[PDB]
Each structure stands twice: as structure tokens, then as C-alpha cells.
């Protein structure tokens, strides 16, 4: 709808009509729609009048570079449109170093690789138990009956929460991650129901776990220090909330993306079923091939970049799809190749905000896939059905009916 007028720093030949929430051809798939943007010869930085007017990085080299220099490209605003964000600070996602660092250090206590190794059995239980619920059926909607459920069940185990509380957490997760609907007033109220609901829910748990010896995410966050002192109660609520939301919409959609693909590549499934080690070693490959995030950075100071003069406060969208699927970075990028030697992507971003959850994500994906093939070694996508895609900050897909012999 709303277009802004081309600013004086945007040359006419960098103008593309791209709506990140409604990509041309999104119905035929999210990755294909982004790739359709990245035509041969496209400049490294283009600009669109939609969503407030913003630049877009169009290949792996540019995505990487904008991601990794907070002095030039700040997380002061990371969400498009620039008015959305945007008051709520969701600490530390909008901080630059050094402010960012000790908040990230608190996140890392719950998510580091050594720590994640020790939760593998709990994640495997979530996955085998979800799958058991439907393996005997010979069909399921992968998205609604596994993907949507899995992150929340993982979070309960990692944050040591009663499984009984799934419905109330699920409701607040819906509200917090995809607010609805009719007016700006309506969406704000909806989001606040999510955010403030989750806030009341975790409050006493925070207080009970101060001084505690559990190694669940909540004890670890609330007992963290920030510049020499125990973290403020509210900051800790913010980290806990971030732990919940960081691993939710990304993982929900990512899991359906790769399952859609495996559903339509039985030979590849055969290959993985036969080489468990190749399966385990190929998480990076799946992350490259199915990136889901398009956050942004704000130009931190006036500066020349990629042939244009950028102004402080301009935004650059970083569609991470355009790194993993970039053929200048990964030859024959459409192939999910478990033997690929050099797997270049920014699916977890880059620089200091590079996904704190990336070790948990790898283990969730591998464990899901192992636990799936144990029970359901052969499977396909239901005849006469198609997935339904949306683009946005996080790529969305649903309707993943899969079927298997029984
Ligand atoms: C498919 C899986 C995932 C993908 C593709 C993904 C992607 C990302 C990306 C791109 C960022 C950087 C955002 C930016 O600053 O531009 C990020 C940050 C973050 N992610 Fe993930 N993520 C995934 C899974 C998870 C999981 C399982 C968790 C567990 C909670 C998680 C927690 C976080 C947190 C806390 C941050 C903020 C890091 C910081 O700002 O310093 N992520 N994620």
C-alpha cells in the first residue's frame, strides 16, 4: 500500500518494488520468492518504497558484512517498518557492544554448546513423544502436530516448567509472536496480553528461583550478573521472554520447510536413513538451504557503502535467504547436499548478535530428524495438498499434510 517518495540518497536505478511482507510469487514458496528478487546482475544494495522506504542487501557478501559491523550498522532498530519495534527494548537485541555484551553473556549460560549437549535426552523425549502421538496413524499435518508444538515443549523442559502449563504458555506465545488484528489499537492490546501474561506467569517463578541450584534457563538468567551486580528483575524477565520467543517462530517454520523438502525427495531420505553420521553432520547444510529470518540493521552514521551514500537512520534489510541461496557463495545452491564441502550462510545472522540459540537449533533439527526416521523411514506429502507461505521478519509456512505406509 503506502509507498514513500524516493529520497535524494537513493539513485533511480537502485529502486525495486519489493514488499517484504508480500513478496511477488510468495504462494509458490518463500525461498523461491526471495530468489526471484535476486536476479543475475542485481546491485549489492537496492532500495524499496514499501514498509517505510528501506535498502535491502541482495547477496551473501553484503548480508555478512552488514551483520558484522555494529559501528557502521547498529541494532538500534532491527525491525521493519522502522516505526514497529519499537518502544519495548527486548534487551539485548537492540543493543550494540559494549552494552550488549553482559546480557549476551547471561543468555550464553543457558545456550552454550557444552550446556546444550546435556539436554539432548530431554529434546529427544520431546521429539519421540510427539512423533508417537501420530506415527500409528500413517498421516499428520507436520506443522500443526509437530512443528508448532515442539519449541514450546522444548522450552518447558529447558526452563523446568510443569507440562500442564502448555495451554496458557501456548496462548501467550501466539499473542507475543503474531499479534492480531483489525486496528493498531487492537494489535497493541493483543501483544500486551501475550507480553504481560507471560510476565505475570513467570514473576513468582523468578522470585522462587533466586539463589536456586537448578540448571534450568530461569534460574540461570535470574542469578546472572550485569556489570558487577545481580541482574534487575525486569531485565531477567526480558531475557526469559527472549529465550522463549527466539526459539519459537524460527524453529516452527524452519522444521516444516526442511520436512516439506524431505517429503518431496525420498531418495535423499533414503540416503540419510542409511548414513546416520551424514545425517548428524548435515545440520549446517539444512540451515543454509532453508533460511527464515529477515531482520534489519540501521545505518549508524552517514557513510558511503556499495556505491551509495547512506544516511544515519536509513534501514538495511538482511534477508538471510539471499546468503544461503546465493550461487556466488554456494554453487548449485538449490541442492540440499549432505556432502557439500563449504557451507556459507548467515541463517543465524553474524556479528555479536549471531544466534544465541544456534547450538540448540542444530540439536533440535538433528534429533527431530533422527526420531522421525526411526518411526517413519518413508513418507511423502499428501496428494492434492499445497503448503501456504508468507514472508515477513520470519518466513511462515503451514499445511504440511504428510503420509506414510502402515
Ligand atoms: C531455526 C532456528 C533459528 C534461526 C534460523 C535463528 C536465527 C536467529 C538470528 C538470525 C538471530 C539474529 C537476529 C539479529 O540480531 O538480526 C538470532 C538471535 C537470537 N536467537 Fe535465534 N534462531 C534460531 C533458533 C533459536 C533457538 C532454538 C533459540 C533458543 C532460545 C534462539 C535464541 C536466540 C536469541 C536469544 C537471540 C538474540 C541474540 C543476541 O541478540 O545477542 N534462536 N536468532
Automatic annotation (TrEMBL):
GO terms for molecular function: heme binding; iron ion binding; monooxygenase activity; oxidoreductase activity, acting on paired donors, with incorporation or reduction of molecular oxygen. PROSITE patterns: CYTOCHROME_P450. Heme b binds at residues 67, 104, 297, 353, 355. It holds the Pfam family p450. Keywords: Heme, Iron, Metal-binding, Monooxygenase, Oxidoreductase. Belongs to the cytochrome P450 family. This is Cytochrome P450. It comes from Novosphingobium aromaticivorans (strain ATCC 700278 / DSM 12444 / CCUG 56034 / CIP 105152 / NBRC 16084 / F199). The lineage of its organism: Bacteria, Pseudomonadati, Pseudomonadota, Alphaproteobacteria, Sphingomonadales.
Amino acid at each position: 500500500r503506502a509507498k514513500v517518495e524516493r529520497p535524494a540518497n537513493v539513485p533511480e536505478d537502485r529502486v525495486y518494488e519489493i514488499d517484504m511482507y508480500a513478496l511477488n510469487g510468495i504462494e509458490d514458496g518463500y525461498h523461491e520468492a526471495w530468489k526471484k528478487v535476486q536476479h543475475p546482475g542485481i546491485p549489492d544494495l537496492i532500495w524499496t518504497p514499501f514498509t517505510g522506504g528501506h535498502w535491502i542487501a541482495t547477496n551473501g557478501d553484503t548480508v555478512k558484512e552488514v551483520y558484522s559491523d555494529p559501528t557502521r550498522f547498529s541494532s538500534e532498530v532491527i525491525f521493519l517498518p522502522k516505526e514497529a519495534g519499537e518502544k519495548a527494548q527486548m534487551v539485548p537485541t537492540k543493543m550494540d557492544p559494549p552494552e550488549h555484551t553482559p546480557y549476551r553473556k547471561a543468555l550464553d549460560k543457558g545456550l552454550n554448546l557444552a550446556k546444550i549437549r546435556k539436554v539432548e535426552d530431554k529434546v529427544r523425549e520431546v521429539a519421540s513423544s510427539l512423533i508417537d502421538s501420530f506415527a500409528a496413524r500413517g498421516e499428520c499435518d507436520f506443522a500443526a502436530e509437530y512443528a508448532e508444538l515442539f519449541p514450546v515443549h522444548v522450552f518447558m523442559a529447558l526452563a523446568d516448567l510443569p507440562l500442564e502449563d502448555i495451554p496458557v504458555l501456548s496462548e501467550y506465545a501466539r499473542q507475543m509472536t503474531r499479534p492480531e488484528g483489525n486496528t493498531p489499537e487492537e494489535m497493541a492490546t493483543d501483544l500486551e496480553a501475550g507480553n504481560n501474561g507471560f510476565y505475570a506467569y513467570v514473576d513468582p517463578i523468578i522470585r522462587a528461583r533466586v539463589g536456586g541450584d537448578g540448571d534450568d534457563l530461569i534460574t540461570l538468567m535470574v542469578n546472572s550478573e550485569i556489570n558487577g551486580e545481580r541482574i534487575a528483575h525486569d531485565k531477567a524477565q526480558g531475557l526469559i521472554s527472549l529465550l522463549l520467543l527466539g526459539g519459537l517462530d524460527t524453529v516452527v517454520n524452519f522444521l516444516s520447510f526442511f520436512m516439506i523438502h524431505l517429503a518431496r525427495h525420498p531418495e535423499l531420505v533414503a540416503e540419510l536413513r542409511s548414513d546416520p553420521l551424514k545425517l548428524m553432520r548435515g545440520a549446517e547444510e539444512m540451515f543454509r538451504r532453508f533460511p527464515v529470518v529477515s531482520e534489519a540493521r540501521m545505518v549508524a552514521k552517514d557513510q558511503e557503502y556499495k556505491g551509495v551514500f547512506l544516511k544515519r537512520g536509513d534501514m538495511i534489510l538482511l534477508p538471510t535467504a539471499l546468503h544461503g541461496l546465493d550461487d556466488a557463495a554456494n554453487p548449485e545452491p538449490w541442492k540440499l547436499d549432505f556432502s557439500r564441502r563449504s557451507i556459507s550462510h548467515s541463517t543465524f545472522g553474524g556479528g555479536p548478535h549471531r544466534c544465541a540459540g544456534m547450538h540448540l537449533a542444530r540439536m533440535e533439527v538433528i534429533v527431530t530428524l533422527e526420531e522421525w526416521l526411526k518411526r517413519i523411514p518413508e513418507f511423502s506429502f499428501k496428494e492434492g495438498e499445497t503448503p501456504i507461505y508468507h514472508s515477513g521478519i520470519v518466513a511462515a509456512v503451514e499445511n504440511v499434510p504428510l503420509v506414510w505406509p502402515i
